[PDB]
Each structure stands twice: as C-alpha cells, then as structure tokens.
A paper describes a structure:
We focus on AMGs that potentially encode chitosanase enzymes that metabolize chitin – a common carbon polymer. One expressed protein showing endo-chitosanase activity (V-Csn) is crystalized and structurally characterized at ultra-high resolution, thus representing the structure of a soil viral AMG product. The structure consisted of two non-contiguous structural domains.
Based upon a partial alignment of the V-Csn, A. fumigatus, F. solani, and S. avermitilis sequences, the corresponding residues in V-Csn are D148 and E157. Two V-Csn constructs harboring either a D148N substitution or a E157Q substitution were generated, and the activities of the respective mutant enzymes measured. Activity was reduced five-fold for D148N and almost eliminated for E157Q. Both constructs eluted with gel-filtration chromatography retention times identical to native V-Csn, and circular dichroism spectra indicated both constructs were folded. In both cases the carboxylate was converted to the corresponding amide, generating the mutant proteins D148N and E157Q. The two mutant V-Csn proteins were crystallized under the same conditions as the wild-type protein, and their structures were determined by molecular replacement to high resolution.
Numbering used by the authors: 0 to 224
Amino acid sequence: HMSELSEIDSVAGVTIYSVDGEPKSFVYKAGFAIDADGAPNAYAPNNGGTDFTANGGDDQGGDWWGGPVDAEGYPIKQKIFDPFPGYYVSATAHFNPAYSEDSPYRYIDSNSIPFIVLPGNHSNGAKLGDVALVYNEKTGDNCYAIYGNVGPSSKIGEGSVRLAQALKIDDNPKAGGTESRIVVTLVFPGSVGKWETPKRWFSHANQLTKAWGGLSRLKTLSDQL
C-alpha cells in the first residue's frame, strides 16, 4: 500500500515529505555523497588520509573544519592510544560525551557506524542521534542509521563510509558515492536525541520500523518519490 505524503521542505531540488501517520517520520529520495568525517583515518598531513587533506580545510593554521584544532589553529593529531597515531582527529556534529573534544573516540567513526547527514538548517525536527531507515532502490539493500553529522545547508543526500558499504554504494571518500537519486532515507525525528550504544539505537530503529510497517512499506513508498 502506498503512503500519504505531505511536503515539509525542499533542498537542492529534493522534496522532503512528512509521511502521514504514526510513528512520526519524514522521507526523501536523493543521491549519496560519502562523508568520511569522524573516521580516524580520514585526514592526515601530506594527503595521508582516506580523503585529501584539503577536503577538511587548511591544515597549516587556516580555516580547518575537519576536526578540532590546537591553540595555534593546527589540527589535533591522534596520540599513541588513538586508532591512527599522527593522523588528524576528525569530528562529527554528533558526539559521545564520555570523551574529550581532542579525542577521536568522541566522534562517530564513519568507517564503522552507519550514519546519515542532514543539511544544516534542514533537520526538520530531527536531533543528532535520532534513527533512520535507509534503502537503496537499485541494489535492494537497506540499513538502520543515526543522524550523525550536519552538512551544507544547500546539499542533501550524504552519509558514512559504513552506510555506503551496507547500501552497496562505492564507499571511497575520494571518488565514491553517487549523484543518482537512488537512496531513500526515512528519518524518525524525536526517536533518540542523544548518544547511546549502537546496539541500543539499532534496536530502537528496528522497533520503530516494525511499528511503521517495515521495509516492505518503504519499498512501495520509494516508487512514489
């Protein structure tokens, strides 16, 4: 059965719809850019990371948005007890408060955690840590994910390296992702709104998805978008 959809927002030519009914959710069909933010091997001096260093900004004291910086504006380098010593600490907007701002463990590791990015100013009621169901209409693959980072306000359709793997999308931060609008993202705003273990939020995503009607309902909905 088709779903009843009501437009709530629009970004970069992609319409965002409230899905009428309960539990509360919104949905959009978009491409999928790779966000390697939070991965502890994303950024390093001299293009040593999985992304080119300049994709995080200027690592010589200029504008650097890839992660935290020291008192002179240079990116914080990981320590001997961090996953990739000497690489830069890459940050995500969602964080684990158990760890300090200079720690890679504070941020969501894009390599290991399925997460979506929502455009800045376009969260549509979702809070970081809320859960989502993500579906690739071309591969039939799906995955639960958290809202883990905030993207440019003018860009939509983006998520983590691990989410790309789960969806069978090229996961390479330098050349992966897709511009084809093949990914359907169903967000449950208000579902979590805090950091918690992946086992816990994945379970909650599973319970919400079951209550909502399951992947079968999202598959039918995908044909409407």
